[PDB]
């Protein structure tokens, strides 16, 4: 009796990949300070973004097959190469380094002084500069070079520019959606009860750290546990927290610009003289403050590992130093740290046998992220003390291999791949897209 | 925006114009102010096979007995071999997502009768009862 | 890659209670995973008891409340593992026993359909021998 | 609750034979929800053929399912030793669901 008819806009969507925009929230152009960060002529997030709770659906999610997270990667990556090519390369900083010992803590900076091109191609230039051990190795008084010269080149990032982390949205184009598990309680796998869409996701600031996720976002009741693989010893351990836990990282040497002319038009911003507390790097954390989360936090695994068992704390194994430090970024430069005394314990089944701690911190101008060769950054120098504080929302954990399962377990602290960092903020989305047209037999006919 | 997908059929069909709305549309007018090389072709790449995506929806709607958005009919008779089902199974006991899972197999076939059958055969037939 | 391995041979007199139990190597979770318990007797065909799909146990009419079907996701220390049990035990319960699970992951796949599926991955099984 | 009817219960063939095993619904299946399993003697059933045409990863080309209506038939073509068996057709199509009375595929000599 019926008869084929086309409707158009039915509710159907299929699980699929494509390329998503960013968005800056309209606010951060008014930010300036000459493009900070990605957004330049990023788009405005619409005033009013728009969440449709959909009743009645079911939908399965997978965080570690989600591709809104390698996207990301790639963005980032791309983005900061695209930083990097306008400014001024410091290819002709090779020359040999005469370095001597800084007027304590083992003369961890060292005063070089080299020759070098001036405006004019005729006659040298005779200087000196302040340069970090990391940033410098020496060849066979005492001769050194740039650690990155014998690997790669070297360019020197604008002053102009921030590496400041600012509000970023993911937004899907036409014909496309953005799922959100609006679950308190999700692991990033499984089926989720209650599911909204959005057009555009919600404020993702890309801080790039390791061993620690800074400035995220908060989780809901309970702490949450997120591995790829569990029993795995070899797949990372994402943990999402729930209070924020208040962190320092400053640089307690109040420095100065040279603001050397290595014409013509190219000014390179050398390290002069600290004149300050003699000191090295440090970060603080309250010592209760941390305690109270571990506790929380390990009885967690033991939703897991079982109700009693014996889990040990210890700082990074070995490797990389992006991998056995707190690598991020504050104030423009660079900070390194030590994690060793806060994953320093032993626990029991519930409970764990003063007013701060401190964290001994490195500097590194000169850096090769991502494990990228034939580029290396160098951070300019600031002038004054960098004082920033941040929120700590996760950690990179991995598990040893040596078993002696059934006894006890240790844990360490991650690090490698940026992608973990932002699988943080996206466990929750998921991009399809939509299939419009549709079939139905209805006795309308026609004439 | 998407509401009764978990709902029966018979109650999506209130909020399909929703659907059409958004779908068909970009209206941001958001950036492209100022140019760049690199990222740009990014947020060009996305929405240009969007209006590609875009208009090969519109020529099934075109090529078809329809001419016209939203809802339209046709003088394709619904064979039996393809969902043998009850009236009030398909609009009130099922939902579009479990009905399209069934049709996947006819989906091409019905395909054909529109714009063959039809629209090929139907405005040939228009022609000469339009002579008269 | 996929490996379902069940428990040992159970030999149990009737009116008693059996469970057995399959662990689910190389699975990453039961919630993109649906678990299916299915007996085949011997000589004869193969048959359907029940279920258990996002986390919610189901059987066939025939079993319903008789049998009871649970799981744990994965572990730490271990792979995902299910139970099937079994009370008032009869001698035509004497069919062997498979542990099967399949991928749900994929919407649109025709593995599934709403409860009711194919099984992809097959255990190595259990026979049960109901004898005095 | 459907009933799945089999024929034949076994049948004899040869090597490089085609082998055609149809199956039969108690109603009208569309939407083709039906698979077909094979069994070694011994081992466990391994699937073979869901939705009745589409064949899974791993498995040689010489299978090739069909579906229409009430009545469903698997099509094996050039027979060789290790596809000798027993066979069986499901359906999934609804709660709960029922297998075949199976069909074994018996070496020819």
């Known amino acids: 009796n019926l008869w084929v008819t086309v409707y158009y806009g039915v509710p159907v969507w299929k699980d699929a990949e494509t390329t998503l925009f960013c968005a800056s929230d309209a606010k951060a152009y008014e930010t300036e300070k000459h493009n900070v960060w990605a957004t330049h002529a990023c788009v405005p997030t619409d005033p009013n973004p728009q969440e449709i709770h959909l009743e009645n659906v079911t939908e399965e999610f997978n965080m570690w097959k989600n591709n809104m997270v390698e996207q990301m990667h790639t963005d980032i990556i791309s983005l900061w190469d695209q930083s990097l090519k306008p400014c001024v390369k410091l290819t002709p900083l090779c020359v040999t380094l005469q370095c001597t010992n800084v007027t304590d803590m083992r003369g961890e900076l060292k005063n070089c002084s080299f020759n070098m091109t001036t405006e004019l191609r005729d006659k040298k230039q005779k200087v000196y500069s302040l340069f970090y051990r990391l940033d410098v190795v020496q060849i066979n008084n005492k001769e050194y070079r740039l650690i990155n010269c014998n690997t790669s080149a070297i360019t020197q990032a604008c002053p102009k520019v921030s590496f400041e982390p600012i509000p970023i949205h993911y937004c899907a184009p036409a014909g496309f959606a953005i799922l959100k598990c609006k679950d308190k309680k999700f692991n990033g796998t499984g089926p989720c009860p209650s599911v909204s869409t959005v057009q555009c996701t919600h404020g993702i600031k890309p801080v790039v750290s390791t061993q620690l996720l800074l400035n995220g976002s908060l989780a809901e009741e309970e702490v949450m546990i997120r591995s790829e693989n569990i029993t795995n010893n070899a797949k990372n351990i994402l943990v999402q927290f729930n209070t924020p836990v208040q962190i320092n990282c400053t640089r307690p040497n109040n420095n100065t610009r040279k603001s050397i002319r290595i014409g013509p038009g190219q000014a390179f911003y050398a390290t002069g003289d600290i004149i300050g507390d003699i000191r090295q790097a440090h970060c603080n954390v309250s010592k209760a403050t941390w305690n109270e989360t571990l506790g929380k936090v390990v009885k967690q695994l033991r939703k897991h590992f079982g109700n009693n068992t014996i889990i040990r704390f210890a700082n990074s194994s070995g490797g990389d130093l992006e991998v056995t430090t707190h690598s991020f970024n504050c104030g423009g430069e660079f900070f390194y740290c030590n994690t060793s005394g806060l994953f320093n314990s032993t626990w029991i089944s519930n409970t764990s046998v003063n007013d701060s701690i401190t964290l001994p911190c490195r500097i590194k101008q000169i850096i090769n992220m991502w494990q990228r060769i034939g580029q290396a950054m160098y951070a300019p120098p600031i002038q004054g003390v960098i004082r920033c504080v941040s929120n700590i929302t996760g950690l990179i954990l991995t598990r040893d291999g040596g078993s002696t399962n059934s006894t006890t377990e240790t844990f360490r602290p991650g690090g490698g791949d940026m992608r973990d960092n932002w699988r943080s903020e996206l466990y929750k989305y998921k991009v399809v897209k939509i299939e419009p047209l549709g079939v139905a037999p209805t006795r309308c006919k026609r004439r | 925006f998407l509401g009764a997908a978990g709902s029966t059929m018979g109650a999506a069909s209130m909020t399909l114009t929703v659907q059409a709305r958004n779908l068909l549309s970009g209206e941001d007018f958001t950036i492209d102010i100022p140019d760049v090389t690199v990222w740009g072709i990014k947020q060009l790449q996305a929405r240009v096979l969007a209006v590609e995506r875009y208009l090969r929806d519109q020529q099934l709607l075109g090529i078809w007995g329809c001419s016209g958005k939203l809802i339209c009919c046709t003088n394709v008779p619904w064979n039996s071999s393809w969902s043998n089902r009850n009236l009030s199974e398909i609009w009130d006991n099922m939902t579009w997502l479990q009905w399209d899972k069934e049709i996947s197999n006819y989906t091409q076939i019905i395909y054909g009768l529109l714009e063959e059958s039809q629209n090929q055969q139907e405005k040939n037939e228009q022609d000469l009862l339009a002579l008269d | 890659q996929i490996h379902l391995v069940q428990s040992g041979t159970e030999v149990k007199k009737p009116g008693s209670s059996v469970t057995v139990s399959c662990k689910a190597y190389?699975?990453?979770?039961?919630?993109?995973?649906?678990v299916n318990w299915v007996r085949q007797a011997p000589g004869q065909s193969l048959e359907y008891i029940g279920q258990?799909?996002?986390?919610?146990?189901?059987?066939?009419?025939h079993f319903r409340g008789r049998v009871l079907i649970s799981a744990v996701d994965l572990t730490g220390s271990s792979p995902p593992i299910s139970s099937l049990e079994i009370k008032n035990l009869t001698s035509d319960d004497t069919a062997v026993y498979f542990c099967?699970?399949?991928?749900?992951?994929?919407?649109?796949?025709?593995?599934?359909?709403?409860?009711?599926?194919?099984?992809?991955?097959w255990g190595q099984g259990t026979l049960i021998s109901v004898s005095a | 609750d459907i009933q799945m009817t089999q024929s034949p219960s076994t049948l004899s063939a040869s090597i490089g034979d085609t082998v055609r095993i149809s199956c039969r619904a108690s109603?009208?299946?569309?939407?083709?929800?039906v698979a077909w399993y094979q069994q070694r003697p011994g081992k466990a059933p391994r699937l073979l053929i869901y939705?009745?045409?589409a064949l899974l990863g791993g498995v040689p080309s010489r299978f090739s399912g069909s579906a229409a209506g009430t009545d469903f038939t698997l099509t094996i073509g050039n027979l060789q030793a290790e596809d000798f068996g027993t066979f069986y057709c499901?359906?999934?199509?609804?709660?709960?669901?029922?297998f075949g009375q199976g069909t074994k595929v018996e070496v020819k000599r």
């Open positions: 099967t699970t399949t991928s749900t992951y994929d919407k649109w796949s025709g593995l599934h359909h709403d409860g009711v599926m194919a099984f992809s991955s």
């Open positions: 190389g699975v990453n979770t039961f919630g993109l995973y649906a």
């Open positions: 258990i799909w996002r986390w919610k146990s189901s059987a066939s009419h």
């Open positions: 109603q009208s299946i569309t939407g083709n929800w």
């Open positions: 939705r009745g045409a």
């Open positions: 499901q359906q999934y199509d609804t709660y709960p669901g029922t």
